[PDB]
Structures are given as C-alpha cells and as structure tokens.
C-alpha cells in the first residue's frame, strides 16, 4: 500500500518485535507460541540490557513520573533525541530503544497498578514508529533482522 511492500513488511516486523518484547517484559500470558529467532534473540538481549539500564540509571529513574501514556511518549521522545544526538546508529543502540520502552512501560504499570491492553499496544506502537523512522534504513543497509541482528548477537 502507501509505503510499498518492503517498507510495510519492515514496519510490521518492527511492530511485532516491539509488542512481543514489551509483552515479555510485562509478563503478559503467552499461548504456546513459537517466537522467531529474531524475537527470541531480541527478548534475551533487550531484557539483559533493560536490567543494566535499570541498575545504572536507578537514581534518575526513581525520579521519573510516568503517570500516563502521553507522559511516557513525551519522555521517550526527549530521551531518544538526547541518545541519538550524535547521529550514530548501531545494533547495540537499537536494542536500548526496546529496553527503554520496557523501562517506561514498567514505570507506567507501577503508577497505574494495573495496565489495560491499550497501554502496552500504544507504547509498542510509538516505540516501533520511532525505530522505523529513525533506524529503518540503517537496519535494511545492515542486513535486517535475520542477517544483521541475529548474526550480531547469536552467530
């Protein structure tokens, strides 16, 4: 359709990866599913990175006030701007995008006590759109998910 087949597939993949990762983070009940190698590998690496983020930035994150989806979006965008200020993209940094998505969603759950399904869907969506818009071309140029990402983290 609007983006053409390749770009649409790319966007769908990134969305799928993001919602799968965030559901894993949150411990949303899975259904004897069989993640792709990319999903499994992303889940393993992004989860360990998220814990490193949470440990290393604890003093900052303890002072975050993620009371709504809109606040999460604002914080996400401002942090991403500061992170990618230097224009460098690599797989390590892409993983931190998913991981920080997870950090914000955990804080949102903490403030709301319980999320509804709409919350994780919306966060996964703005995360995925960021990744596609800012790093989708880089991802394509660097082997995509099956050839780049998997070969980087699970050779």
């Amino acid at each position: 359709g609007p983006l053409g087949s390749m770009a649409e597939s790319e966007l769908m993949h990134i969305h799928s990866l993001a919602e799968h990762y965030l559901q894993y983070v949150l411990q949303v009940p899975a259904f004897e599913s069989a993640p792709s190698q990319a999903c499994r590998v992303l889940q393993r690496v992004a989860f360990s990175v998220q814990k490193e983020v949470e440990k290393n930035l604890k003093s900052y994150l303890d002072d975050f006030h993620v009371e709504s989806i809109d606040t999460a979006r604002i914080i996400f965008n401002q942090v991403m701007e500061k992170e990618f200020e230097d224009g460098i993209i690599n797989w390590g940094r892409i993983v931190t995008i998913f991981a920080f998505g997870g950090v914000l969603l955990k804080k949102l759950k903490q403030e709301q006590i319980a999320l509804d399904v709409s919350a994780y869907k919306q966060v996964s969506s703005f995360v995925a759109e960021f990744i596609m818009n800012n790093t989708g071309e880089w991802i394509r140029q660097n082997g995509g998910w099956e050839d780049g990402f998997i070969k980087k983290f699970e050779p």
């Binding site: 942090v79 992170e83 390590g92 993983v95 983290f153």
Partner: peptide, 24 residues
C-alpha cells in the same frame, strides 16, 4: 548545564555502544 533526560539518553548511548562492542 545538563538535564536529567539528557543524562539518561547519553547513558543509553553508552550502554548501546558498550553492547555493540561486547558482541563483536
């Protein structure tokens, strides 16, 4: 001077680059 979200983003970049080097 710096800002909290500045510091947060710059620390994410550090971790990302460190991970990129870790799996190399």
């Amino acid at each position: 001077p710096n800002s909290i979200l500045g510091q947060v983003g710059r620390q994410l970049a550090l971790i990302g680059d460190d991970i990129n080097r870790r799996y190399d």
